[PDB]
Amino acid sequence: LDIQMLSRGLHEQIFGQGGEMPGEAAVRRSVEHLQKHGLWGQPAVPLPDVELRLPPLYGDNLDQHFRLLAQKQSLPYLEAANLLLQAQLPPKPPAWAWAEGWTRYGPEGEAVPVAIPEERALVFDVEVCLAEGTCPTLAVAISPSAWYSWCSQRLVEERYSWTSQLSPADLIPLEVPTGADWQEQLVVGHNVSFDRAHIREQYLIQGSRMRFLDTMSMHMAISGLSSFQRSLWIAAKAISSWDWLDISSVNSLAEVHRLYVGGPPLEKEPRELFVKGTMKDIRENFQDLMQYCAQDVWATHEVFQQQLPLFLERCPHPVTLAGMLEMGVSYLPVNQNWERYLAEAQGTYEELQREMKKSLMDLANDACQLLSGERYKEDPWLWDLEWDLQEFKQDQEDLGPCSEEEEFQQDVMARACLQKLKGTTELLPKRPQHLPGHPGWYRKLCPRLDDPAWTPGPSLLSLQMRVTPKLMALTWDGFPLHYSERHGWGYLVPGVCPYRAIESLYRPYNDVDIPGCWFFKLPHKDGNSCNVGSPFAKDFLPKMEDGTLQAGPGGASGPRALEINKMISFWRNAHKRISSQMVVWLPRSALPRAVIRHPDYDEEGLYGAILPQVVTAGTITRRAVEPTWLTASNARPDRVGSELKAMVQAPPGYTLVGADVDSQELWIAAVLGDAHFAGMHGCTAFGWMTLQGRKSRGTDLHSKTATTVGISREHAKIFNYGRIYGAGQPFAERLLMQFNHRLTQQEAAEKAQQMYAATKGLKGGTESEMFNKLESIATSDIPRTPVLGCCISRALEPSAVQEEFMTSRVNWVVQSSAVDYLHLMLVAMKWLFEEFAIDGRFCISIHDEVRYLVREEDRYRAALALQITNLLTRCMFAYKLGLNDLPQSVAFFSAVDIDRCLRKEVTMDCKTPSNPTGMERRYGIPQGEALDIYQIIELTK
């Protein structure tokens, strides 16, 4: 109805916040702050007015409406947890049942077979045999009433499929037979996501309304270890501060139980039959393994009992608990194209590495000569190798065609006489000697003959070895790379030899020219450039595109090796995790009627889900941690296997509706500093860069910097991203490293002269310093995060370390705030999907991003809901602190991606194999501000 801007683009209309606290009349401070060093003048480009009828609010006020939503979400689960918290726990049974299905043990150890554990609350654990690792092997559970065990068909010996449909254990009963909690169940466990991966009903597309709690998540939120803190904790089994050792523990169950419960130490199996054992040995040692698993389950139950009140008091707001429950429900659907993608990626990796392997084995074989004439001694590359040799240690006319050739067998048995020589002699060397005749350096590169995975030639020869550079590699004029203590110079961060060969290859004592030919056998080499940390593998790729770096055979061999290494590095690192992902393929009966009735439903095709097995709070900032899914490469053409995200494809009749928060960390820091400075949203200069900032003009955060080299795309952005977080002086010298690498004292003087985003003694920040709020939060010891409250850790709290690991503490604020944002988004999305019939409650777990598996017929509606959350969430960040209003620029997501697969942008093809049309995946056509025409009620349009 009105612009309602107040000199900045502010969110149009106010529906839930109400009208009060109009202005503090302290605008002059922000005015002459923005006047200083320019930046006051602004176009102030308007945005289209948005008029939306929000759903009714039960709370009647923000920060109470969300409290009511979280309470209504987590009431049954908190009730179940409280029921589990009471102590009515019987002792462990004397002997386990050893029977298929679920078996319950009440008093005196009597075992009764039961179809399903009829318990509202459970503490669950599954132990899995590494052989055929997809199947769950065995599992146990404990409730306040009785114990439960599950074996997974170990009495009968058979051959089983790799699909793993019915393999996972059943844990949910039918909705028609539920306790009067009621239809709500909570499962507690250490690394509970691993156990959730083995639950039969957790793979259905429809919602399961069962939630999970992770003991590692609660421990990490309460008391976790970050980076050196963890390693030092292992080192002691930090300077002038080690109190945190007594309140900190690693994420392992044993140390967690030692820290919290403090009972007798838990002991692990030296046999580790589940990890390094076969199935038969597990069958024989069934009782001991089940006893150990039950002991671990008891330990996790005790830890949960000791954790729940501490977690609740350190995280009072129910929104955090509800978001934690919701984050452990990620689905990540997939279809038959997942296996095809895995096979294609493996084949491509084998192709690329085989090409490079052959190219290297050729050089190795050609270099295996030069030993006959002792030519390696005069060689300028291979004279350092040992070149050892070890002993074995032991006419007559045509005469006719002849006949009676049947006696040929005589000579055959003559050959057998030499077989007899195996026994009559050879006993002086019974162990098979490995290539005595070849040089020792070539000897090392070949696989042992007894190896089942044996291939001809020096197959154990890849890049980044100490011999491959000597085979061909050469820099400038100087040929040698001794690497005895330090390699051949280079890299980013600093810190008999035939002289006749040195003269021939030309084209204290000191050196007239720093580069050029190497001189003398003294390996000190004057310490030029980085010495010890030079791999000579990757960083030199753009430095190699000139005469400074040249390979032996050809000018394109070295570049080809570097390019192929870059292509296959990611897959070499990640193929074990990616190919080992657990996939459960749903049968036709399990799929809903919508999927089978939908067109383009590929019959004779496999559909399933890959539960990410993600730790909800694996990082001390409560951030979700998963090695593969959360940390995976975006689709790229050069890198092999980068299309991992694109293979998360919704089933027929379903789609992924998600979004991405625009500069979540930067906006959070900006608004926090803005609130710390004044009460308006554009008061801080950094806030004005973040809010209403354009790269076209100087209003952008990175463009206004000095930019000594003069680049805004790369030079000015890495500088800004490094000054925040660490704010290191070596990071300042890295700019001198990049360009203008001269006059180092001048570089230091220039860096000192840069006061922007910097503070002096006259302590606290002055002028454009957002760090003041972060430092104030970092030294409070009360519930620290400004949004809804969350303490950092008893390990990293003040009075445990005085001034140590400060950077981790200050980044925890903006990082923990992002996690709270994610929790708020999840709570709002759950509320919106429950209040209005929007089927497809499932979500996909990503950091700074939330994707939801929805039906096509509500693809746009759900998107609108997301935008509504993106409003109501940011309003929370406004409701806390002094910012009563919210800017219009960040009020909504830039674009809501509706797609059939998971990718950063829907208008993007991976083209890793350069055939993106092999799988049916069209564009997404994201919607931004065009969804407001509809309403969230189903009976619309």
Partner: protein, 372 residues
Amino acid sequence: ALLEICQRRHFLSGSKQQLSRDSLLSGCHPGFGPLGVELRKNLAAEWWTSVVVFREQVFPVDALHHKPGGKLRENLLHGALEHYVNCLDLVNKRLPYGLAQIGVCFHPVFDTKQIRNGVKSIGEKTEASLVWFTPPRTSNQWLDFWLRHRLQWWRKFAMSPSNFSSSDCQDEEGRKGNKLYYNFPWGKELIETLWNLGDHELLHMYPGNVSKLHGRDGRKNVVPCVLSVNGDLDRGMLAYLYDSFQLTTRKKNLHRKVLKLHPCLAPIKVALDVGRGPTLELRQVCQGLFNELLENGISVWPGYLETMQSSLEQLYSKYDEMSILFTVLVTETTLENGLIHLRSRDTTMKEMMHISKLKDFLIKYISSAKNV
């Protein structure tokens, strides 16, 4: 140039000095030598293993060299098209299948200028043709799959796989296809073509009814599109032989002059020989080893019938130019301790190894060379 004289010294390219780039590429060469024949047989066997044997639905078919009115054949595709209907019964109408064949095809060669060849000067080329009947919906998927598979096969057994390349192309009718080339020293030469005919030939040769040509790709029955994958092996042999040789490098100082062919398609694997010692009691051992290796299936150069011995070092060069993986020497010391020498292709280092279990060593060397 030098490669050509090497090939002919060791009876690989063929006979007489008439062979050149144009005659070799056009198929007008007088014929391949015994080593050339062995290389062709090995390449055909590898192609058969990669295409026909390892695939359940691909079947062998035979196409007559001439067709009735007849002017011989220029491609093997027509025979596969004629056998489509007959072989549909064999696959019980499982539509996505194929017919593979290897045979000699005839092409006109135009020398031009003097001695106009016209229809004469027929050039013979060994063509391996796979005609793959596919559903229309997934025709492009199978096109890409076959292109990738054939490029892998050609890059397999390749000393420098980067020389092999692929390109896209469109027919005069607009039909998609791909062409694979090998980068010879003079330039890239075509060695294989994949074409997506799109079921035109089926209706052309069977215009009566379509109901008899229907094949099941699932619940429904459709008229298959045709994917013709036609590669030539003579140019394949030329490509592999040129790739095995060196260029035409800096501070090389190595002049071994060796044809580093792949172990799987090398013409001769191991060469037997006799060391310095008493005649007889060594010829019998060599004969027994020869019989063992032939019963295994490893081709062996006898080598122990020659009596020059070429000072023991020139014959190593002869075998290297002959593309022989191993040189087995049986000396008088074999009767005392059953140990023989192994020079081996590449890494010209003497290997002492017991005569026993050489069966296992050679079989494993041949089998494990295919994989990496």
